[PDB]
């Protein structure tokens, strides 16, 4: 046999899969807050004033987020919990389409440079 | 007299997906990086190391990331862009499922322990 040829690719898709889902719900909890943030901006000024300071640095986990929101204000925490959510059932699904043809494309144009 | 209630509400959504195609390429990078950082490990060692030197604070944007790559390591560049574009082709299309469903399960759990 030949064995110094690598058994696995190293891609744990399943892994890799979880990851990114975790990534991406972190990021539309944020994208979430920042609408939120915007709605409070034309209807509660202060309470806009009091989260934009209460969430800056604390937007890595969001999950770890809303649980530490919901210790402080119950219902604002629900706020970004619905939007998080109304923004996932609209654009997921064009998500694949896009990170796909955009690699493919961010790739051919330095291929073509380069290569 | 619809005069206090908002126009619309902050969600602009051709932007929010744009801006989470752009995260999601590039954590598939970051990714793709992890698998040929990985594979060197096992095949070349030095050059994992080299690798990962050359890695550490620059992953934020993987187009910036790969430009600053093909000065150095044309050969690197052009595996994670390879694998980048794998990985993508591979788990783009069950995202959106683990999102939604995600959030909606993590939404609910948060409420569950609290509310």
Excluded: C
Excluded at 22 to 36: F, G, M
Excluded at 72 to 95: G, N, Y
């Amino acid at each position: 046999s030949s064995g110094l040829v690598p058994r696995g690719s190293h891609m744990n898709l399943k892994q890799i899969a979880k990851d990114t889902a975790k990534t991406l719900q972190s990021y539309l909890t944020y994208q979430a807050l920042r609408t939120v943030l915007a709605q409070l901006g034309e209807t509660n000024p202060p309470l806009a004033l009091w989260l934009h300071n209460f969430s800056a640095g604390k937007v890595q986990d969001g999950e770890k987020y809303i649980e530490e929101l919901f210790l402080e204000k119950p219902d604002l925490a629900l706020r970004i919990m619905t939007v998080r959510e109304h923004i996932a059932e609209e654009i997921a699904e064009f998500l694949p389409e896009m990170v796909v043809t955009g690699i493919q494309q961010a790739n051919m144009e330095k291929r073509r440079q380069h290569l």
